[PDB]
Ligand binder design. Structure first.
Ligand SMILES: Cn1ncc(C(=O)N2CCC2)c1C(=O)Nc1ccc2sc(N3CCOCC3)nc2c1
Ligand SMILES: [Mg+2]
Ligand SMILES: [Zn+2]
Length: 313
């Protein structure tokens, strides 16, 4: 009850900022996550013993892949923490509980391959889940860990509150399918501009939580340039491995995943910032003005990629 987590001063201060990097010390990541739950939710939200045991089972079920790993899980949870802390009164008690857990679980048991690759490989998961293949797997894995003895961190919720939180977590994990992002943001754009956006409309909240999930999931592009640049290496290491596997199935991969087109990476980052990142943080800032630092950091990084193309780095 009276057992807080406390971080060193530099971390205590920087963790509140959107651009915080959780650092290379893996053994501190669980404590950083519990710290965020305690300040975002309260020290009473979860039984500490059950929470710690849930965190270590989730960690164990992330794989040693270059990007879709345990560090990504905690990084995406920190961005959600930052959004929630800067928008105190906009979110219910169940949403704060659900969304930090959703972010930690959103890529559970990722193998470093896209939905496309599973479908062309004809992976068993592509027969079990025809769309959002990995995302339905990630939610399924989340429910599994929640049902290990001693792992039900939601045990003190009523039957109906329990169903609401698992429903929040399910929609939040499905929304990390970037194929669903484009249409979700277009709808949010129209609703905001025609003034029909209503946060008491549950279907509207769902859309806004979906955009938050895309924003947290892409947060590599909102860090300081040195973090953004070194994370891009991890991202492309997965993409190029998938490219290699596409070639092994007798399929030329898209350029994004072809390691023979390393030269085109800076221009590929431009298209991605313009087509996905900038629009994502723009619409998010319109709906949640205090998330403007994410849009500002994204724009800074776009400018850094333009400088790479111009040979200034
Ligand atoms: C930065 N970032 N963060 C998340 C993601 C992301 O897509 N997701 C899916 C799981 C993570 C990305 C990212 O870089 N995405 C991205 C998208 C289109 C193209 S086209 C291209 N080039 C083609 C031409 O040749 C060079 C590269 N490179 C890219 C890179
Ligand atoms: Mg994912
Ligand atoms: Zn992710």
């Amino acid at each position: 009850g009276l057992m807080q987590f406390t971080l060193p001063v530099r971390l205590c201060k920087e963790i509140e900022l959107f651009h915080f990097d959780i650092g290379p010390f893996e053994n501190m990541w669980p404590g950083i996550f519990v710290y965020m739950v305690h300040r975002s939710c309260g020290t009473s939200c979860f039984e500490l013993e059950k929470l710690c045991r849930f965190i270590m089972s989730v960690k164990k079920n992330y794989r040693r892949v270059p990007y879709h790993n345990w560090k990504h899980a905690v990084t995406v949870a920190h961005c959600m923490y930052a959004i929630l802390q800067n928008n105190h009164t906009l979110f219910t008690d169940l949403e704060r509980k659900g969304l930090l857990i959703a972010c930690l679980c959103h890529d559970l048991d990722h193998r470093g391959f896209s939905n496309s690759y599973l479908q062309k490989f004809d992976h068993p998961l592509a027969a079990l889940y025809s769309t959002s293949t990995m995302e339905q797997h990630h939610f399924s894995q989340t429910v599994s860990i929640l049902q290990l003895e001693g792992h039900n961190i939601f045990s003190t919720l009523s039957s109906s509150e329990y169903e609401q939180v698992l429903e929040i977590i399910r929609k939040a994990i499905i929304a990390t399918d970037l194929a669903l992002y484009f249409g979700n943001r277009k709808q949010l754009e129209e609703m905001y501009q025609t003034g029909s956006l209503n946060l008491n409309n549950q279907s509207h909240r769902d859309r806004v939580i979906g955009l938050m999930m895309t924003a947290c999931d892409l947060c590599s592009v909102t860090k300081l340039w040195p973090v953004t640049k070194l994370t891009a290496n991890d991202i492309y290491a997965e993409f190029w491995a998938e490219g290699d596997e596409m070639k092994k199935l007798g399929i030329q991969p898209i350029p994004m995943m072809d390691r023979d087109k390393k030269d085109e990476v800076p221009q590929g980052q431009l298209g991605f910032y313009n087509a996905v990142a900038i629009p994502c943080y723009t619409t998010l800032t319109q709906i949640l003005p205090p998330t403007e630092p994410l849009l500002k950091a994204c724009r800074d990084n776009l400018s850094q990629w333009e400088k790479v193309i111009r040979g200034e780095e």
